[model samples]
Target chain A: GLADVAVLYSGGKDSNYALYWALKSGLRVRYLVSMVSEELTSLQARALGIPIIKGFTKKEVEDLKNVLEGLKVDGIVAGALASRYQKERIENVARELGLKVYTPAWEKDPYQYMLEIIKLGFKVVFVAVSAYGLNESWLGRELNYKNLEELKKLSEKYGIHIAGEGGEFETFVLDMPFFKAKIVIDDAEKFWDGLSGKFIIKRAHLEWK
Target chain B: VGLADVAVLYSGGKDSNYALYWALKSGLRVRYLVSMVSENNVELTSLQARALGIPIIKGFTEKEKEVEDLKNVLEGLKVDGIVAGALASRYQKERIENVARELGLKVYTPAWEKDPYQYMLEIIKLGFKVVFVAVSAYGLNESWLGRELNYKNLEELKKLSEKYGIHIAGEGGEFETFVLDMPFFKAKIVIDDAEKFWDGLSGKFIIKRAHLEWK
Candidate 1:
């Protein structure tokens, strides 16, 4: 295990699970690196008792390199499951920086990863959706076994990634086993364009577990 | 009379703002802000809903779609009733009532056929901020446009009512009103840009850009 590592975090499910893997694997987690085009990273870091450093981006891959070069770490982790475009670019940055890169979520079976999210006790909520067969009704709903079957059907019929790795949707982790606190969503609004939707969280706070 | 939940037909106007406030004061949780895309104020009302921290569903208007679309959304909301600010517009109230009744939903028009003379006074007394958007009828001139309806203007408006027999609260289309702030609203709404137009006898204040000033 790498002694010091940073997770390229986006406050989404895969990234969070990767962070969890990094934590449980006995790595000395250094920072939760966020692209400030982000959410919940600070709160997630606070709950995980890790420091968070947010990086600003205009041109993304090189922007990531800027963030990584300045940080004192041996490696970085990403949650790029089945996304070669994201995976290669991230690996490219670690290569340029001569640091090890681990994408524990790489190429995992979609259904297994999704079910694991629920079984592993990650209180994840859909924050946004754009794929067909899913609607605004899905937003703000915590994933569960009941919805998992429904999602799998939608995944087949609509041809969207079951794990939403293709940006078909996004999620926010409210509670995870490694988290010291739970994010209780107090208020939010769904801004839904006819074909797409986003659950913008207006008021949320961490409740100590 | 005792609905636990209701949706306010918010127009971002003074009356509807008051209706929303009334619904809240009566211990009803406003589950949604239902707006018809029939208004130039539809976006304004959405901002109003955002400021008040409520979800809004906007329905489009047309030949058959307007009322049908409204009904379609109301059914999904699953609220006990709906709230409106229908003041003496019989056609307006009846249309809403008919739809509400058809859906088995109660309709609460808080300012139904009230004396706007006293109503206007109460609005000022209740600390609701309003601005003039349009002025018609004989006595009111272009000067009324973009003016805040407050204490001093209330007396002048009264004198105008006495002189020209125009309704003081613009009930008969003497003017149009917009609510800038309300007691129940969580933030202050301000105009980023506005354009005032006066076509001889009638004039209106067009809000070009409006948004909530979140502190």
Candidate 2:
């Protein structure tokens, strides 16, 4: 059981899934806090039925601390499945301010968790790939059962994290359970540097379902 | 400039090692060393840290996530300042300053704004064994990779810098280097095996294994 929690959202697959899990687990969401890099548009947060607070790039922890203090939420929730770099830092700040920390997907098997995103009905697309096995063709390709199987093979062959835990790739959510509207990417550009690429959302808008 | 303790942004690279060297020389207690590893080898960096007897903290971050993870890691250290090796990049320096300033931590840059030619020569004169780990520029080739920095290479680099207009310190991504041994190192890092990953133009020397031997 969790208190009224503020979700650390990035409009990415893990964070969006965490948001879904938080609501399903009966955690009352106070606000959605997002970091500033590649920010999710305000409209997307509105469609998801929560107001988003933008965190700073340089002052991420300090800024986040400020936001959390302003919101005065009971606790904070994150999708930090791996990497103590994030977990420890978040815990450090949260503990200092007397707010309980919750990581819903902590230490879960990444391979299965990637599949669970689909099982939980998240329409996600790969926005970036910076690893060997993942090619440029992965950009903007939606996650499906077929591609998931291919990812599993690629994971095994290349020793890449299936869920991109090692920063091999990044994803964006198009639709999910909590969303009242779907994000439709009208225009985007591919920035591919031979071995790495990013499908930058040049233009996007939310539409009522 | 006047912090009791500070953290050095270390990458096992040349500039970072130089910064670490200066941090120690300045009588500031280096509390910890932090590294952001997206594609670099952790073991080699760990060995490098072990050689210097400094505890190293590493995080995996790419793109803008780098600053996010760094801010988190630095906040917990409760240090008074951060020492960086930003020689010429306003982007790198400003980004680091932004994080440090937010934490109310002072930023120290020992090699900032120095002439590139003099900077590379000073690195050699300072008795640090800097090795080229990656080369990408047009004038440089794979043969330069894994070669230790010395007067010979410094001279070659100066000529290359003059001809190709490359930063002699390799500040602008022309090449990357790692420091194997420094004056303060209790032990020296010995690279056993390294394999090259070249894409014809730019490539890195991935260290397969490394161990520290007595200085």
Candidate 3:
């Protein structure tokens, strides 16, 4: 059995998959931490059967520390893949509270990592694309094995992370292996500023698969 | 003044001077020194600024106006990043980070979350002559107002830390200090007139005059 973990969830592809991996690794998924402004539906919370704690600001490590302390987690589970900045800050805060830190997908090969997520049956959708070669059409596009291959080629040509690790895009998880229900984005809108765009989910609900 | 340029949040204090040193060591060119007027020895800071040969920008702000005033002072500087000497005080760090992020500038906290004992030791080893400007804690009183921080004082600080549960590096507002000399400065600051302002519980060694001298 693994440690009781508090997942730093964002209802995004990386964090959602990280939560899935935590469960598969036999860790007690004690809590889900979310940004206050970043929307994570109640339906999603019910599907995961965990309480969502809200954090504020980008440097809200203090808030996260308080949340972790309150929950008495042995360690924190983050989805940090390549951002050394975020990883260091999180580790420093955790150290202050004498809690361990874990990043399961840290520094893994981006292309293969996305492919692995698809193979593991996690359904992810791009909510935003903010880089070259990632066109507006990529917004709302569900990531599959075929699309990941195309993304790899685009990554090579444009020097972008295939998994969107470098803020090249953003994503959300609709379903995963551990999910009791699947998210259905019924209404959305695209706002494109020529260079980048975001597919904003206006309304979403969870339905049993 | 290119992409790697940074604005140092200086206070003529030891920690901020160390932060400036850290930035210089990291190969980032410091474009400006931003200083908040209150709770700092401004005359010494100006002399230090003159000695360091860097442009100094000062802003007058009380407690709550720090973030806004600092942002205003930094707005005119041509830099891409901010370097601060914040070791604790998550409130201060977050406010500065917020302003930096909003202004599209990176933040480099060279003295953030450092172990107090090691940090004080590092300051002494790095050859900085820092003197206490103020004392505001239980163990630290009027006697500590004008004392220099060296290996001997650091030993005392460690004892005080253990006995009083205070931050060895003075992160808990136990005391405040100003750097007299450092490697980056072409000269040193000399205090001319000094007065003690002790309110029984705490006090500051206020310097009325100061001048810079060549090394």
Interface CA RMSD of each prediction in angstroms: 19.7, 14.7, 21.2
lDDT of 2 at B128: 90
RMSD of each: 19.5, 13.3, 19.9
Error of 2 at B187 (Å): 0.8
Candidate 1 structure quality by residue, lDDT tens digits, A73-96: 789999888878888898888999
lDDT of 2 by residue, A26-59 (tens): 8877567765522244545656656454443335
- 1 or 3: which has the higher TM-score? 1
Q: Report the lDDT tens digits of candidate 2 across residue range B150-192.
A: 9988989889888988888887899988888998788898889
DockQ score, prediction 1: 0.02
Clashing pairs in 1: none
Q: What DockQ do the predictions score, one after another?
A: 0.02, 0.03, 0.01
Backbone clashes in each candidate structure, one number apiece? 0, 0, 0
TM-score of each: 0.51, 0.52, 0.49
Candidate 3 residue runs with Cα over 4 Å from true position: A1-209, B1-3, B38-40, B62-65
lDDT per residue (tens digit) for residues B101-185 in model 3: 8888888988888888899899989899899998888888678887998888999989988998878888868888999998888
Candidate 2 chain A, which ten residues in sequence have the lowest lDDT sum? A35-44
Q: Which CAPRI level is candidate 2?
A: incorrect
List TM-scores of chain B, every candidate.
0.90, 0.94, 0.93
Q: Pick the candidate with the highest TM-score.
A: 2
